[PDB]
Write an enzyme that holds these catalytic residues in place. Structure first.
Site, PDB file in Angstrom:
ATOM      1  N   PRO A 247       0.984  -0.894  -0.152  1.00 34.74           N
ATOM      2  CA  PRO A 247      -0.069   0.219  -0.262  1.00 34.74           C
ATOM      3  C   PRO A 247       0.543   1.417   0.029  1.00 34.74           C
ATOM      4  O   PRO A 247       0.112   2.445   0.961  1.00 34.74           O
ATOM      5  CB  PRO A 247      -0.475  -0.257   0.695  1.00 34.74           C
ATOM      6  N   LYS A 248       1.990   1.121  -0.298  1.00 30.72           N
ATOM      7  CA  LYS A 248       2.783   2.873  -0.534  1.00 30.72           C
ATOM      8  C   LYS A 248       3.694   2.526  -1.492  1.00 30.72           C
ATOM      9  O   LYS A 248       4.562   2.220  -2.450  1.00 30.72           O
ATOM     10  CB  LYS A 248       4.095   2.038   1.255  1.00 30.72           C
ATOM     11  N   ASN A 249       2.974   2.120  -2.383  1.00 28.00           N
ATOM     12  CA  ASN A 249       3.155   2.664  -4.161  1.00 28.00           C
ATOM     13  C   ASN A 249       2.317   3.180  -5.022  1.00 28.00           C
ATOM     14  O   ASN A 249       1.203   2.930  -4.403  1.00 28.00           O
ATOM     15  CB  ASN A 249       3.084   0.223  -4.676  1.00 28.00           C
TER      16      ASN A 249
END
Ligand SMILES: Cn1cncc1[C@H](OCc1nc(Cl)c(C#N)cc1-c1cccc(Cl)c1)c1ccc(C#N)cc1
Ligand SMILES: CC(C)CCCC(C)CCCC(C)C[C@@H](O)P(=O)(O)O
Ligand SMILES: [Zn+2]
Lengths: 312, 401
Positions: free
Chosen positions: A109-111
């Protein structure tokens, strides 16, 4: 088809269906700089994707090829695009694709791409029916995910899904009032819906905040936020407040409080008041208790403040 | 050592007896950092702050030519990888042979696209991040061959394929929009002398539109204030000369507030942990606000130090951001990579070199060998490489088509 992380999974170069295709190697050059020593799997899936991309083969074996080439580097835009192109040309089911993106985002979820992909599908399917909740799923694994709060803002603006947000920010805030994301989402809802000009609400947020600001006197969030709203209009428009704060000096003190007071003396001086020498005295005083002992880390800042008031 | 000073200890966190995930995680770090602080007064050794120039050099020197399959996730950011190492070596004041440079040049080439941009690897659709890094890296070289390569014409053509009508810019054809693109496009278009009287219309206006209720700047309007974005926004406004578009005084107070009182390093967003790279993104904001404020004619502005704690930031980077094997890093315990290395050094430099015309005050901490080459606050590349850059491309025309 074959999961890229399945014990069975087999290299493409060993696959039948991919026998007519000649994978094209990367072209780094005679003298390669920052060359990466790709693993076999990785170098397989991509040299092949190169071919498919190369002969713009809008095939199905390719659409599958991108699920892999994506798992090997979900941050490879050139590939996320070809996929988009294949979803359309191949007339693929966007709900299926919803499930795919949902999952793969849970994995990272950090893309940037995984999230941009989500937006597109929602713009294609013109349907956010499942947004505000999958996003809460992520924000449940990490309440400060920059992308999650960004997607959430969009979802809310575009389809006007306001309403229940404060009932959301109110939740998480109790969940951890030190969260600066929710405090931002708070200013987001209000400012965009009911606004702050409305005396009541403001009057309301002000209290609520203050309690926190007096419930966790060392939370710079409730502090930056309280000044966040009263700040536009002039911190000096609200007489009460000051003392209402001074009324914490002993009780609930912190560089935040004192700094607030210094912040006020700065407006209480812009709109030509009375007691210059008392403000331009008790205010320079503070920049000193702050720059000399209280908040010395930003010593050059505080000393600068008191050095500014002097001239202007 | 301000950090080893005894009073400092009172700079710890006061969780006002109310525990949360935020305070908790901060507690873990504040205690971690402590250990390395008292490491000295623990082994009974005299604190000596040095920069393993030599160990960072070997870690890099080769990294610039080959990396493990651990850097696969950056298979699409190779040009980035170049800038990070290159600038790093440059910052350590190391030499980039006439060999290797040419090797690089030739690499970025294939990275470039016949459409005008720069991909993140040979034959990859153009993107503004890799384009920004590519240009920057080619400007760290200087050599005619380098400056060339860049197809200025197609570059503007590209920048044009991204301009949006509300001002903002697209990260890449089909991609997203966040301040990063503004600065990225502004850094290159300016350096390449390809800016037009319209190229950047409404940008300064949209960028500022990102300044939120907390002095900082977010990726997109309504988005929380962030250090990487605030730099991009302010830096972009500088290139455009519209500094006056934001509430400079409010941003300053925000940024200055991002320096950790205990750790000493900067945090990316209020109430988040410290991170070496923000030693540049955050700290790097001060050299700019300075030029703007002064630009405004401010007389209460210093003349020897930046409006942030140079001493303490410098300690943190040195004490807890250096890998003993080479390379710098996020915070202690984390692993090394070239991004953080590049921005940890970048922050270091920014923290020990001051200027204001004839003004020039340097504050190298510990060993005087820890003094690094100067870096430009906007382009993040030698102030000279940027001089060479412009003046050169300047001698050429603005792709008026
Ligand atoms: C972890 N973190 C802490 N603070 C920021 C980040 C995080 O690291 C990702 C990232 N990690 C690494 Cl390890 C490397 C390298 N080498 C490069 C990048 C990297 C990838 C793409 C671009 C860049 Cl500049 C760096 C990150 C995410 C997005 C952006 C942006 N825009 C910058 C940093
Ligand atoms: C591409 C550039 C010129 C600059 C990028 C600067 C940045 C460090 C941007 C940070 C991106 C984001 C949203 C990171 C978040 O994951 P976090 O706040 O955890 O660091
Ligand atoms: Zn970092």
């Amino acid at each position: 088809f074959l999961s890229l992380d399945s014990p069975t999974y087999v290299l493409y170069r060993d696959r039948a269906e991919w026998a007519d295709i000649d994978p094209v190697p990367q072209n780094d050059g005679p003298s390669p700089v920052v060359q990466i020593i790709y693993s076999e799997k990785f170098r397989d899936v991509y040299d092949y994707f190169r071919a498919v991309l190369q002969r713009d083969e809008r095939s199905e074996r390719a659409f599958k090829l991108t699920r892999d080439a994506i798992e090997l580097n979900a941050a490879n835009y050139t590939v996320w695009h070809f996929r988009r192109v294949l979803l359309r040309s191949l007339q693929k089911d966007l709900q299926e694709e919803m499930n795919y993106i949902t999952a793969i985002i849970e994995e990272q979820p950090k893309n940037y791409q995984v999230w941009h992909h989500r937006r597109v599908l929602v713009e294609w399917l013109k349907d956010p029916s499942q947004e505000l909740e999958f996003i809460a799923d992520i924000l449940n694994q990490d309440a400060k995910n920059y992308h999650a709060w960004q997607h959430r803002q969009w979802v809310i603006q575009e389809f006007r899904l306001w309403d229940n947000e404060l009932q959301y920010v109110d939740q998480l805030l109790k969940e951890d009032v030190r969260n600066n994301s929710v405090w931002n989402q708070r200013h987001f809802v209000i400012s965009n819906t009911t606004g702050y000009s409305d005396r009541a609400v403001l009057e309301r947020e002000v209290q609520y905040t203050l309690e926190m600001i007096k419930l966790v006197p060392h939370n710079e969030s409730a502090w930056n936020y309280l000044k966040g709203i009263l700040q536009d209009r002039g911190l000096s428009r609200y007489p009460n407040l000051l003392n209402q704060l001074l009324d914490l000096q002993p009780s609930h003190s912190s560089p935040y409080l004192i700094a607030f007071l210094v912040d006020i003396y700065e407006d209480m001086l812009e709109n030509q008041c009375d007691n210059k020498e008392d403000i331009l005295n008790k205010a320079l005083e503070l920049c000193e208790i702050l720059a000399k002992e209280k908040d010395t880390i930003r010593k050059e800042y505080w000393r600068y403040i008191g050095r500014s008031l002097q001239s202007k | 050592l301000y950090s080893l000073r005894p009073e400092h200890a009172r700079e710890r966190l006061q969780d006002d007896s109310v525990e949360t995930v935020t305070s908790i995680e901060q507690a873990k770090v504040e205690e971690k950092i402590q250990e390395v602080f008292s490491s000295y007064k623990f082994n009974h050794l005299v604190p000596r702050l040095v920069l393993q120039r030599e160990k960072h050099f070997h870690y890099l020197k080769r990294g610039l030519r080959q990396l493990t399959d651990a850097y696969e996730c950056l298979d699409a950011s190779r040009p980035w990888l170049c800038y990070w190492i290159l600038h790093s070596l440059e910052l350590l004041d190391e030499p980039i042979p006439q060999i290797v440079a040419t090797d690089v040049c030739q690499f970025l080439e294939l990275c470039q696209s016949p459409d005008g941009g720069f991909g993140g690897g040979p034959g990859q659709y153009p993107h503004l991040a890799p384009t920004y890094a590519a240009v920057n890296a080619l400007c760290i070289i200087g050599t005619e061959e380098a400056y060339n390569v860049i197809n200025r014409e197609k570059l503007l053509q590209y920048l044009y394929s991204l301009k949006q009508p509300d001002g903002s810019f697209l990260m890449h054809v089909g991609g997203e929009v966040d301040v990063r693109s503004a600065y990225c496009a502004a850094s290159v278009a300016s350096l390449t002398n390809i800016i037009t009287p319209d190229l950047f219309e409404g940008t300064a206006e949209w960028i500022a539109r990102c300044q939120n209720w907390e002095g900082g700047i977010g990726g997109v309007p309504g988005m929380e204030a962030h250090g990487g974005y605030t730099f991009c926004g302010l830096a972009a406004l500088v290139i455009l000369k519209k500094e006056r578009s934001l509430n400079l005084k409010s941003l300053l107070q925000w940024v200055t507030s991002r320096q950790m009182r205990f750790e000493g390093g900067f945090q990316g967003r209020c109430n988040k942990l410290v991170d070496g790279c923000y030693s540049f993104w955050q700290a790097g904001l001060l050299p700019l606000l300075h030029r703007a404020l002064h630009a405004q004619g401010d007389p209460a502005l210093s003349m020897s130090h930046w409006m942030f704690h140079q001493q303490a930031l410098q300690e943190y980077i040195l004490m807890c951001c250096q890998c003993p094997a080479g390379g710098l890093l996020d915070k202690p315990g984390k692993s090394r990579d070239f991004y953080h290395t590049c921005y940890c050094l970048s922050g270091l430099s920014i923290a020990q070199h001051f200027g204001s015309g004839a003004m020039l005050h340097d504050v190298v901490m510990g060993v005087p060998e820890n003094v690094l080459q100067p870096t430009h606050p906007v382009y993040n590349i030698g102030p000279d490489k940027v001089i060479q850059a412009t003046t050169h491309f300047l001698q050429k025309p603005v792709p008026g088509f």
